[PDB]
Amino acid sequence: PLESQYQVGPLLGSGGFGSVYSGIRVSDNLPVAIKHVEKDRISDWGELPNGTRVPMEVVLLKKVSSGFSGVIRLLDWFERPDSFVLILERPEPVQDLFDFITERGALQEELARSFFWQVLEAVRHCHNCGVLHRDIKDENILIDLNRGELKLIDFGSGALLKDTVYTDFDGTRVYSPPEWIRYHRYHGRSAAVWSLGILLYDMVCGDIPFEHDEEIIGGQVFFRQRVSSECQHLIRWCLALRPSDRPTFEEIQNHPWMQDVLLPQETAEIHLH
C-alpha cells in the first residue's frame, strides 16, 4: 500500500528528473523521492530472486543499495497495473552538478578534484556491485551542500556489468565514446572512463568539450579555460580515441592531479557553505 505508507507531495523539479514527486515516509517522517516509470516505456527488463519481472533500473538500484552513500539508495518499490513506483532517498539541501556548474562557472581545481574523486569512488562501487551506469554526466550527480557529498542518480540507462562487448546504448550521446559513434560497439569500463573525461573537462572548463559527432571522433581537446598541465593530461588520457589507451580507474586515482583530495566535510566548509 503506497498511498498509506507515504505522504505524497508535489512534483519535483517540474519533471526534469522524470515523473518524480516529493514524499514523506509515514513510518518515520523520512523524506523520499517517488519516481514513476511507465511499463510501456521500459527498455530492459530484469528478474529478481523471487522471479518477479521488474525494470532493469530496479535490479541495478537494488544491487548498489548497500548503503554506501555515493549512489542514490532505493528504499522500496511497488508494482502498479501500468507502472512501477520507486521510493528513493531525498537528501536535502541538494543541487545537481549541472545547475551548480551553470551558476558557478568553471570550478576551481581543488573543488573539481574533490567532486571527481567522489564520482570515481561511486562508479567503482557500482562496478564492484555488478552495475554499469552508462549515463555519467553532471545532470545525473547530486551535491549534498551541507555534507559536501556527491550522489550518482538515474540508473535508467544502466546495465549489468559484463566483460563482453555492448551493442546497445541509451545514455547521453555527447558523453558517449568514439567507438560507439563509429561502430555502435563499446566495452563498459573504457566507455565509462571516456564519460568521466567529459565530466572532468565539464567541471574545470564550465561546459562539456564536444557537441557534435565530428568533435567526439576527431581526437582534439581545446581548453577554453586556464587548466593545469596535470589536469589537462588526465583529461586527454581519459579521452584517448582508442579504448585501450585510456586509463583504468586505478591509474586515474593514482594520477598526480588526483592526489591530496579534500574530505567531503572539508569540501563543504571551504567551497559550499
Partner: peptide, 9 residues
Amino acid sequence: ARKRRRHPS
C-alpha cells in the same frame, strides 16, 4: 556568452 545546455538521454 556561449550557450550551455542539458542533453536528454
